[PDB]
Design a binder for this molecule. Structure first.
Ligand SMILES: *[C@@H]1O[C@H](CO[C@H]2O[C@@H](C)[C@@H](O)[C@@H](O)[C@@H]2O)[C@@H](O[C@@H]2O[C@H](CO)[C@@H](O[C@@H]3O[C@H](CO[C@@H]4O[C@H](CO)[C@@H](O)[C@H](O)[C@@H]4O)[C@@H](O)[C@H](O[C@H]4O[C@H](CO)[C@@H](O)[C@H](O)[C@@H]4O)[C@@H]3O)[C@H](O)[C@H]2NC(C)=O)[C@H](O)[C@H]1NC(C)=O
Ligand SMILES: *[C@@H]1O[C@H](CO[C@H]2O[C@@H](C)[C@@H](O)[C@@H](O)[C@@H]2O)[C@@H](O[C@@H]2O[C@H](CO)[C@@H](O[C@@H]3O[C@H](CO[C@H]4O[C@H](CO)[C@@H](O)[C@H](O)[C@@H]4O)[C@@H](O)[C@H](O[C@H]4O[C@H](CO)[C@@H](O)[C@H](O)[C@@H]4O)[C@@H]3O)[C@H](O)[C@H]2NC(C)=O)[C@H](O)[C@H]1NC(C)=O
Lengths: 209, 34, 210, 34
């Protein structure tokens, strides 16, 4: 067989907010119980770097092993196309495995946010859904969140980026609330974080006139 | 979250006057400041 | 080394509309040139069947092979949880590979359909989006379409079912139109087909009213 | 589509009166009928 490798990109919100810390993660699965020594080699646009933080291996219930190296990156570097290569070297492997990832190439496109109130037919229920349509953005890397009264509402579920017919993406975010909170006229806001948004952020409120 | 650091960051990020080296430097600074 | 196998379920609409013909598909990749013989064996809840239609292999561009067998199924049978096992036998196989798939288990839940008109902020554009939130259904097998004036509208795009916090799924369908058609008061319908819908079908209309 | 066949089908499929055999038989008939 052979241990396997998967390279994971940073979280959209991590690359956009200067507060957060974006990291590219390198995972190694099917790591042999007898030859568990795993060595990582990280490279940015060719040049090797050494500030990756490798975590202690861990036997997986299927009696194998799993090792993970986390490379912290620069929001700019990721946003600027820089390429991140992870090179895994192990015994049970003829030659070190290599995986490379970078941000999607292509003209970014500022997203448009629209807040839709619940359908009338839904007011018969005890909870109603507030929708936040986010369309025409690119690349698909994006982060949607809801809040009210400054506080974050967490009972929401965003769909994953869907490719539209014009080559851009669009998704929808459904926040679920108590009819009571809604009809009471409270104000909710859908915030979107994207690279093509001024200051990588925007908001749209939603309530009952 | 500081709405100001996000502004200085986006700002520095798209400053057409700074080069890769300067930008990084200016950005790092914004990072350490908050 | 040895051929790989993938079993694909029928299309939601094919198991729900009595018109269509639902089929489970067995695909085999990695067949070898000198070791090219593929034998399929189909089973429904254990019992073998012999009405699968195997297609002519096709030498893959990556120098390997791809053979497919299509088994026509009974709408009911699938909708009832029957199990479809495909057994692929080849020489490069120590032992025949088996794959089984069936409808997702769990109590069906009737989807709720709500139509949302465009956001006000969108009326500054020449094309607006008519949204169709479909929620609380189970299983994820579902089919949404749009229409108007009895005719089907095709400029829409549906999101894949998303797992909600209550174990059920929900999705959204965005039909895009010319502001003119919408403001002119035309009436559009979002139609949903699901096993948990009376007659596997339902629709909700959307137009101008304000 | 032929909403009537879709109805006769649904009906059959959920007829608590028939058994697997009868069901399949009744469904099939509606299939060929349209
Ligand atoms: C031994 O057990 C390992 C760990 O298993 C535990 O965790 C889960 C995986 C469950 O199985 C659980 O029951 C076990 O306790 C197995 O590791 C997995 O191995 C598979 C096979 O390669 C990996 O599959 C990949 O999955 C990713 C999805 O990534 C997800 O990321 C999140 C974090 O963001 C993780 O938290 C999730 O767990 C996922 O890992 C895919 O992106 C990736 O796709 C690519 O390869 C496939 C190959 O066909 C292609 O089809 C695609 O197009 C892509 O190219 C791939 O499917 C999975 O990530 C591993 N899980 C972990 C935690 O690393 C191991 O496989 C198993 N081995 C044996 C012999 O049993
Ligand atoms: C030889 O070439 C075959 C064809 O390759 C494709 O891509 C390029 C490179 C060309 O060669 C083209 O001819 C062709 O388009 C390879 O076959 C492919 O093999 C992969 C696995 O190696 C198969 O992946 C599996 O696909 C399932 C869904 O695929 C769907 O999408 C494709 C294209 O959109 C359709 O053709 C299919 O009909 C399907 O609709 C997917 O479900 C599988 O899931 C994987 O992940 C889950 C995670 O849990 C896991 O459980 C599962 O086991 C899989 O790991 C999987 O991704 C792919 O279907 C198959 N393609 C076709 C067209 O059959 C062949 O590998 C290659 N071999 C070599 C040695 O080169």
């Amino acid at each position: 067989g052979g241990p396997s490798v998967f390279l994971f990109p940073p979280k959209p919100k991590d690359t956009l907010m200067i507060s957060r810390t974006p990291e590219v993660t390198c995972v190694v699965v099917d790591v042999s119980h007898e030859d568990p020594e795993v060595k990582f080699n990280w490279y940015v646009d060719g040049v090797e770097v050494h500030n990756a933080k490798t975590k202690p291996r861990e036997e997986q219930y299927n009696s194998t092993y799993r090792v993970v190296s986390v490379l912290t990156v620069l929001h700019q570097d990721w946003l600027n196309g820089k390429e991140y290569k992870c090179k895994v070297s192990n015994k049970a492997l003829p030659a070190p495995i290599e995986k490379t990832i970078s941000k999607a190439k292509g003209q970014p496109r500022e997203p448009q946010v629209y807040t839709l109130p619940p359908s009338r037919d839904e007011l018969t229920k005890n909870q109603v859904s507030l929708t936040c349509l986010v369309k025409g953005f690119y690349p698909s890397d994006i982060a949607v969140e809801w809040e009210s009264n400054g506080q974050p509402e967490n009972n929401y579920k965003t769909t994953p980026p869907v490719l539209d017919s014009d080559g851009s993406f669009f998704l929808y975010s459904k926040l679920t609330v108590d009819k009571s909170r809604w009809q009471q006229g409270n104000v909710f806001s859908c915030s979107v974080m994207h690279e093509a948004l001024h200051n990588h952020y925007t908001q749209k409120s939603l309530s009952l006139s | 979250f500081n709405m100001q650091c996000q502004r200085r960051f986006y700002e520095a990020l798209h400053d057409p006057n700074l080069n890769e080296e300067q930008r990084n430097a200016k950005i790092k600074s914004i990072r350490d400041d908050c």
